[PDB]
Design a protein around this ligand. Structure first.
Ligand SMILES: Nc1ncnc2c1ncn2[C@@H]1O[C@H](COP(=O)(O)OP(=O)(O)NP(=O)(O)O)[C@@H](O)[C@H]1O
Ligand SMILES: [Mg+2]
Length: 89
DNA sequence: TCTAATGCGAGCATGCTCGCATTAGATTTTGTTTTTTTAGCGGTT
């Protein structure tokens, strides 16, 4: 199923998501994986914010991913990481 | 580097221009023209 959360800048979408994930961490710390997919220059920020709960003070079930990092983990599981890769140069 | 002043003598109409040579001075730039894209690390050695 899909959910389109839409609103102008300042709507509170990101905090709404942060809080959603936090509550879902409260309910079941070992539940099914929760993937937070953000731009690469936004991975750390969210990681910090999720970690800022007096309740839990961290995350385990839920990770923050870039497209690249997500590719790294899923490929670590599924395979195909053997081949070397080429920098742009 | 070219323009101007200084000196001297020959031809002309004893004093005057003119030729020539030469040096010495001073006098002196302006201008303008771009952006290049494209998604932070890495826990474990
Ligand atoms: N319920 C709330 N009440 C007051 N301030 C809030 C609330 N939720 C979030 N904020 C603040 O609002 C600011 C922006 O929240 P955010 O979650 O980024 O909204 P947003 O929809 O993502 N805006 P944007 O990312 O620019 O499109 C932050 O400074 C939050 O601390
Ligand atoms: Mg936001």
């Amino acid at each position: 199923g899909a959910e389109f959360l839409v609103g102008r800048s300042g709507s509170g979408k990101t905090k709404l998501i942060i809080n959603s994930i936090q509550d879902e961490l409260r309910r079941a710390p070992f539940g099914k994986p929760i993937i937070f997919l953000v731009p690469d220059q936004m991975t750390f920020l969210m990681e910090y914010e999720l970690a800022k709960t007096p309740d839990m003070g961290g995350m385990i079930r839920a990770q923050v991913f870039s497209f690249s990092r997500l590719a790294w983990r899923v490929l670590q599981h599924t395979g195909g990481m053997s081949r070397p890769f080429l920098t742009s140069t």
